[PDB]
Amino acid sequence: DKTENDIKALQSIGQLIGEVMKELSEEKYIVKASSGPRYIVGVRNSVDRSKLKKGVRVTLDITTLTIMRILPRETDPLVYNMTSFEQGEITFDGIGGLTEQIRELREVIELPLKNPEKPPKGVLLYGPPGTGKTLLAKAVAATIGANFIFSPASGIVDKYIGESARIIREMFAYAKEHEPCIIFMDEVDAIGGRRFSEGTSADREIQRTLMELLTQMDGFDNLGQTKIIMATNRPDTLDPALLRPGRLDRKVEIP
Amino acid sequence: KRIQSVPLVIGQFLEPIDQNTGIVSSTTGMSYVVRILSTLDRELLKPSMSVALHRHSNALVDILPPDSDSSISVMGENEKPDVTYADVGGLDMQKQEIREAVELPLVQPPRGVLLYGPPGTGKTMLVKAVANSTKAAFIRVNGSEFVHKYLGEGPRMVRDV
Amino acid sequence: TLEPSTSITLAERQQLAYDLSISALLGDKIYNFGELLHHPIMETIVNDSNYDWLFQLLNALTVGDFDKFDSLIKVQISKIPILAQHESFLRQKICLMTLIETVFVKNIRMLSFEDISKATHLPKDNVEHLVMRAISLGLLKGSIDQVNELVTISWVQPRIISGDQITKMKDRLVEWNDQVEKLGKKMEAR
Amino acid sequence: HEKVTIAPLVLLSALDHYERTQTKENKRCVGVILGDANSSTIRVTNSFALPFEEDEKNSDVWFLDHNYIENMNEMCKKINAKEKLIGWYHSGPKLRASDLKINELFKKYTQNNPLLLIVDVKQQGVGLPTDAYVAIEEKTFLHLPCTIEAEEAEEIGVEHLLRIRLTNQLKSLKGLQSKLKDVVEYLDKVIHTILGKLQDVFNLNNLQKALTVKTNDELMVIYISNLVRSIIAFDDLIENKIQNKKIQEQRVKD
Amino acid sequence: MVLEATVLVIDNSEYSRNGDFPRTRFEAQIDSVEFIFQAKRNSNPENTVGLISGAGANPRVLSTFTAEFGKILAGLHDTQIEGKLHMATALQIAQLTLKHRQNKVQHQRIVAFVCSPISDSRDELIRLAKTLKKNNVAVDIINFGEIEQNTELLDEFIAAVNNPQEETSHLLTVTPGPRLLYENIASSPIILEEGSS
Amino acid sequence: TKETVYISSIALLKMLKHGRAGVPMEVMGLMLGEFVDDYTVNVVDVFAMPQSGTGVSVEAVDDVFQAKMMDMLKQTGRDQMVVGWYHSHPGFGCWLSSVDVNTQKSFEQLNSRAVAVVVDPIQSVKGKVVIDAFRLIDTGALINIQALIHGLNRHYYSLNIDYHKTAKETKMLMNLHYEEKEESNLAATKSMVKIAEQYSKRIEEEKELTEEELKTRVGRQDPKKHLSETADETLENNIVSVLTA
């Protein structure tokens, strides 16, 4: 019977996905295919023309091309493209001797959550990594309870001739939903920094990406319960505008 | 009349070739000579439009008044922004400047205005604060948003947005 | 509620219906006037004793002469003297209702005021109250022209009888009707 | 209150029932109606013949089985969940005290008070050949008005059928027809107080005031465009058509 | 044995309201029914019965045509206990009932409790009996009345229905005392013996 | 070859109304009718197979349900031949399924012949009806002939549709649109309330026109177009406003 189910389920066929861009009419919908462009579509059945709403992931049809189901939603490799590890492996103490930071960061990171009396914008490590340095993040991540979300850089725009905010906003939004979350962006000079001649190597990709954070930071997007740890081994390697408050309220030394 | 029908494909109208002939854009990237409503002509036909497209008859079913957020990647909207102005203190000249630049001419001339400097410094805050008071439909955009492989859509709502 | 069922006794029947007929008085009311008296509370109630009154009160519910009754009054009815007001309340309303129901037929309203209000044969300065009061009678609508001595009136007057406008009814209402068909000839047809 | 949608599918079928059942006026073909009844407008999705027996020789004698509805709804539910029992139909055209018995049987099976449905299997009189009653209770039952919906899929096949103002008047007689008669009916039927209740709103006519004449005031401007309505007609075509003719008639080169 | 449709006529009435032997008459009715109906469905499977209300102020079917437990199901719920004769009507219904009896070649049968004083007219009674015999119904009656209900319609009736016995009518008029209905009628050709015609 | 399919539009609309919700899946179930000599395919009725969560499938056909109904239908006096298959094929001019064929095919075994009735519940909505019936094989033909005896018959292969009802329902059906009197003149006497707007409407109709006319001096907002159109609508109500008096 188990195998039979598997046997049977081979009749059960795949059904396309998309978010509702909007509701044209009660049935009539503007939905960009999660695979591709927009389409005018109708409802189907077991469908709540009520519930059907902007940005709502829905199952879609291959031929009828309409809703095949209404859906929850989330995207991206949370543990891979996003990197999802909860808190950190060893606490701040095990790497102690950075204690200045240890305290100093905790108060400007962990606490502002638990004391409604700005929240902090951003915090940037620098100095040699992994000294406990990279570990700090985990040790940081450990202390708060938030989900530590690690960001390596270039994957956020490999090639992949695009994927910027969609990446980062999933990193934002998932965390924004999954908050408390720690956002830790590794050594961000490929997707961070002021670039070069500021010419186009695809640097225009970087600047965007460079700005996508800026947009989330100098933009109204806050760290609700999700916080962002910036990482660099050298600080001076970053966009001056990035260092700015409204983006970074802490420049974290590690002597 | 009855030949119209629903389960269509979205697109963007480009330009009429003649009356009852025009080129549109496909969300799929096609753009082609198609037929249209006998309904719209030149009047009710509109210069570019989000448009209802027959699939294999592949023709224009209708213009579309609505929507927004294909990719592109949407539009930044805080409708009624949360920022009062003068909340980065002393921007008066600049505050008046924007006001001079936009807030006033909104009533009564530039089509566009450049904010220059480090943003989010209060600089970006200028916008929302302004955008707050302005009581117009606000649209934030990120150049850092238009980065979708679908090089076919791209400007499409950038126009329509 | 008892109307369908529940066989009872007369000492149950009338005495209740008495107290009922009594509670008509200690009602009194939005009048009422006419009532369940139709229903077999009558003979049954009246008969006699205070039912005489209770019947004669139904008479006063029409006649509305004080001393056709303020004659009759013993303690129990004088026990609530406020009927002496209620009969004025009656007489007015009693006069009014038919004054209302008929006298104007011709799109009835005006009745305005005084002689018409003294036509209640309750006097003009009480008119300056009784007639003046309207839903301060609990009931009447309309208003007052003090100067011209005109009641403005509106409905809040129910009524009855038969035989009369019955024919009138269909006449006009078939009148346009028939005549309409002239116009009502081709229009959406053609 | 809950006044209802009407389903032509039902209506037709119910008549084919009537047809099929070979029902005569001696009988009324009866059956389930379907929909969902919660709203202040009930909808009738569907409806089903309840194989039945009716005898008015002895009124209360008649036969029906529920076990249909039993077996029915199961499939019906299995067919569609929205089918939930709203009530029931019959032929008619008119009521019989046998109804009330029949009525309350469904009350077992219905959410709210279930719904009667009169049909005119002869479709004779008017808008609707139909009434739908719901018991109230001194019993009450009542007809709330109802109508057809879309049901465009129906209307589409309906579109395959058929093929402004006046009618609006055309009922001018109907009630007024029976009405005074209806009086004279009851008048000389018994030869109730409700009728007198009907009475007072008669004066609600000869009412007309100068207030009336204010109509034309309104009607004045109402006519402003009457020129303009045709003024553009009064302008364009044959100008251009002549031009077009002058084009066309002068075209005529070789 | 039986291939025919039956009807169970229950008065829950001045008698059924009132225990004629445990636990009530109306209750004494009950398991006697299943007892009967068991033997009825043991007579043959597919043997069908109706169940109506001859009780109360409303005649009606309680259990419609079936063939198993769904009746025993249906009969499970009560009735108006003190109710009154619909019998004629109830029967006349039970007749029309059998006019719809399912997958005919099933002859018409009726089984009738008498829990009521039995008010009806002889001609009507016999018009029934006629109509039955016309319709060709098997009619057997359960009667324990005051006195009993007998020297009466019920006695004429079983006769009046009857040219052939069980193709038309047999009677038993239920006796008082430690008389268990199902035990009583075990005797009568209301059940067992010869069962149908 | 040229064959006559017939529907009581009841069964039609029944399908429709059932097919209208049918999406995604085809609505399935019996079809009730007969064959009168040849060519004659009538459908008096039809009905749903109860939904198959697995979707449309040859297994999903339950002959209990029919029996159930058909009994209750035979109880209704409702009785016919199962005349074939009917389904709702959204967006589908198409063809149904080799399965759907095999479905019918294994089924049409149960008959001399049957149908598989295509409905596009989507494109049926046009106000015309999209619909079809396959039964793919022939005797010879109207007698097509070769492909069976020469084997390998795979084609769309429609039958030829018709249907019939009556003037009876037709009248009642035209009765769609107490009633009108309550419903019309007099219910829409609601007219004078907005006269100020009815002015203002007309008053706004005004400005739109010189503007429009002005252009008279292609591409558009035509100088001549709305002008009439603009006002003209008002007229009827603008007209009838009088009538009730």
Q: Any residues with CB less than 8 A from the CB of C45 and at least 6 apart, and which? A: C14, C17, C18, C20, C21, C51, C54, C55
All residues of chain B having their beta carbon less than 8 Å from the beta carbon of residue A210 are 144
Element (H, E) at D14: helix D8-20
DSSP-derived pairing of the beta strands A181-185 and A83-86: unpaired
Q: Does chain C reach chain D with at least 3 CB pairs under 8 Å?
A: yes
- Which residues of A participate in the annotated binding site for ATP? 127-134
Q: Does chain D reach chain F with at least 3 CB pairs under 8 Å?
A: yes
Phi and psi at residue C141, to the nearest 5°: -105, -175
Determine whether the interchain pair E100/D62 forms a contact, defined as Cβ–Cβ distance below 8 Å.
Answer: no
Is residue C127 classed as helix, strand or coil in its secondary structure?
helix
Q: CB of B4 within 8 Å of any CB in chain F? A: yes
Asked, for residue F203, whether it belongs to a domain, the answer is yes
Tell whether F6 and F51 lie within a shared domain. yes
Task: Return the number of CB contacts < 8 Å for A and F.
Answer: 24
Query: Residue holding tokens 């004054």?
Result: C99
Question: Are the beta carbons of B53 and B59 closer than 8 angstroms?
Answer: yes
B122 is in an annotated binding site: yes
Determine whether the interchain pair B6/A207 forms a contact, defined as Cβ–Cβ distance below 8 Å.
Answer: no
Query: Residue holding tokens 């399908």?
Result: F15
Give the closest-approach CA distance of D134 to chain F in angstroms: 18
Determine whether the interchain pair C165/D176 forms a contact, defined as Cβ–Cβ distance below 8 Å.
Answer: no
Q: Considering only alpha carbons, which residue of chain A is nearest residue F22?
A: A45
Element (H, E) at A86: strand A83-86
Helix axes D152-159, D8-20, angle to 10 degrees: 60
Query: Which residue in B35, F24, B34 sits closest to A41, CA to CA?
Result: F24
| Three-state SS sequence of chain F | CCCEEEECHHHHHHHHHHHHHHCCCCCCCCEEEEEECCCEEEEEEECCCCCCCCCCCCCCCCHHHHHHHHHHHHHHCCCCEECCEECCCCCCCCCCCHHHHHHHHHHHCCCCCCCEEEECCCHHHHCCCCEEEECCCCCCCCCCHHHHHCCCCCCCCECCCCCCCCHHHHHHHHCCCCHHHHHCCCCCCCCHHHHHHHHHHHHHHHHHHHHHHHCCCCCCCCCCHHHHHHHHHHHHHHHHCCCCC
Asked, for residue F172, whether it belongs to a domain, the answer is no
Query: Which residue in B73, B79, B24 sits closest to B46, CA to CA?
Result: B24
Determine whether the interchain pair C159/D203 forms a contact, defined as Cβ–Cβ distance below 8 Å.
Answer: no
Q: Which of F163, F198, F216 is the last residue of a domain?
A: F163
Q: CB of A69 within 8 Å of any CB in chain F? A: no
CA distance linking residue D225 with residue D234, whole number of Å: 12
All residues of chain D having their beta carbon less than 8 Å from the beta carbon of residue C100 are none
Question: Are the beta carbons of B56 and B50 closer than 8 angstroms?
Answer: no
Q: Considering only alpha carbons, which residue of chain B is nearest residue F218?
A: B42
Q: Exposed, middle or buried, D236 (CB in 10 Å: 0-12/13-18/19+)?
A: middle
Determine whether the interchain pair F220/B42 forms a contact, defined as Cβ–Cβ distance below 8 Å.
Answer: yes
Question: Are the beta carbons of B9 and B28 closer than 8 angstroms?
Answer: yes
Q: Token pair for residue D218?
A: 């309104």
Tell whether F186 and F226 lie within a shared domain. yes
Q: Domains in chain F: how many in total?
A: 2
Determine whether the interchain pair F91/A12 forms a contact, defined as Cβ–Cβ distance below 8 Å.
Answer: no
Asked, for residue F80, whether it belongs to a domain, the answer is yes
Tell whether F106 and F148 lie within a shared domain. yes
At position D160, the amino acid (one-letter code) is H
Find the chain D residues whose C-beta atoms sit closer than 8 A to any C-beta of C: 138, 164-167, 169-170, 172-173, 176-177, 179-181, 183-184, 187, 193, 195-196, 199-200, 202-203, 205-207
Neighbours of A54 (CB within 10 A): 14
Neighbours of E172 (CB within 10 A): 20
- For chain F, first and last CA: distance in Å? 64
Paired with F45 in beta bridges are F32
Give the closest-approach CA distance of B93 to chain A in angstroms: 22
Query: Residue holding tokens 């007689």?
Result: D173
F25-54 residues touching D, CB cutoff 8 A: 44, 47-51
All residues of chain E having their beta carbon less than 8 Å from the beta carbon of residue D53 are 96, 99-100
Query: Residue holding tokens 């007998």?
Result: E150
Tell whether F144 and F195 lie within a shared domain. no
All residues of chain D having their beta carbon less than 8 Å from the beta carbon of residue E92 are 55, 58, 61
The partner residue sitting opposite A44, judged by closest CB among F23, F57, F91, is F23
Q: Which of F163, F186, F201 is the last residue of a domain?
A: F163
Determine whether the interchain pair A40/B76 forms a contact, defined as Cβ–Cβ distance below 8 Å.
Answer: no
Determine whether the interchain pair F77/D162 forms a contact, defined as Cβ–Cβ distance below 8 Å.
Answer: no
Asked, for residue F103, whether it belongs to a domain, the answer is yes
Q: Considering only alpha carbons, which residue of chain B is nearest residue F221?
A: B43
- Which residues of A participate in the annotated binding site? 127-134
Tell whether F91 and F53 lie within a shared domain. yes
Determine whether the interchain pair D101/E60 forms a contact, defined as Cβ–Cβ distance below 8 Å.
Answer: yes
**The length of chain F, given as a count of residues:** 245
Neighbours of D249 (CB within 10 A): 9
Q: What's the farthest any 2 CA atoms get from each other in chain B?
A: 63
Asked, for residue F106, whether it belongs to a domain, the answer is yes
Determine whether the interchain pair B6/A27 forms a contact, defined as Cβ–Cβ distance below 8 Å.
Answer: yes
CATH number for the domain that contains residue D88: 3.40.140.10
Paired with E169 in beta bridges are E139
Residues C27/C28/C30/C35 CA torsion (nearest 10 deg): 80
Asked, for residue F169, whether it belongs to a domain, the answer is no
Tell whether F113 and F225 lie within a shared domain. no
**The length of chain E, given as a count of residues:** 197
Paired with B11 in beta bridges are B26, B51
Tell whether F81 and F149 lie within a shared domain. yes
At position B104, the amino acid (one-letter code) is L
Determine whether the interchain pair F220/B7 forms a contact, defined as Cβ–Cβ distance below 8 Å.
Answer: no
Q: Which residues of A65-78 are buried (b: 16+ CB within 10 A; e: fewer)?
A: bbbbbbbeeeebeb
Tell whether F30 and F137 lie within a shared domain. yes
**DSSP code for A25:** S
B90 is in an annotated binding site: no
Question: Are the beta carbons of B22 and B33 closer than 8 angstroms?
Answer: yes
Asked, for residue F147, whether it belongs to a domain, the answer is yes
User: Which residues span the domain enclosing D127?
Assistant: 1-163
Q: Resolution to 1 decimal, in Å? A: 4.6
Cis peptide before A174 (omega within 30 of 0): no
All residues of chain F having their beta carbon less than 8 Å from the beta carbon of residue D231 are 227-228
Phi and psi at residue B73, to the nearest 5°: 80, 75
User: Which residues span the domain enclosing F218?
Assistant: 178-245
Asked, for residue F173, whether it belongs to a domain, the answer is no
All residues of chain A having their beta carbon less than 8 Å from the beta carbon of residue B148 are 162-163, 166
CA distance linking residue A156 with residue A26, whole number of Å: 38
Tell whether F189 and F152 lie within a shared domain. no
Element (H, E) at D31: strand D31-36
Query: Which residue in E120, F99, D152, F98 sits closest to E128, CA to CA?
Result: E120
Element (H, E) at D46: strand D43-49
Question: Are the beta carbons of C167 and D180 closer than 8 angstroms?
Answer: yes
Tell whether F143 and F49 lie within a shared domain. yes
CA E91 to chain centroid, in Å, comes to 9
Question: Are the beta carbons of D32 and D48 closer than 8 angstroms?
Answer: yes
Give the closest-approach CA distance of A131 to chain B in angstroms: 33
CA distance linking residue D51 with residue F78, whole number of Å: 10
Query: Which residue in F178, F174, F197, F194 sits closest to F186, CA to CA?
Result: F178
Tell whether F107 and F150 lie within a shared domain. yes
Chains near B (3 or more Cβ pairs under 8 Å): A, F
Tell whether F92 and F153 lie within a shared domain. yes
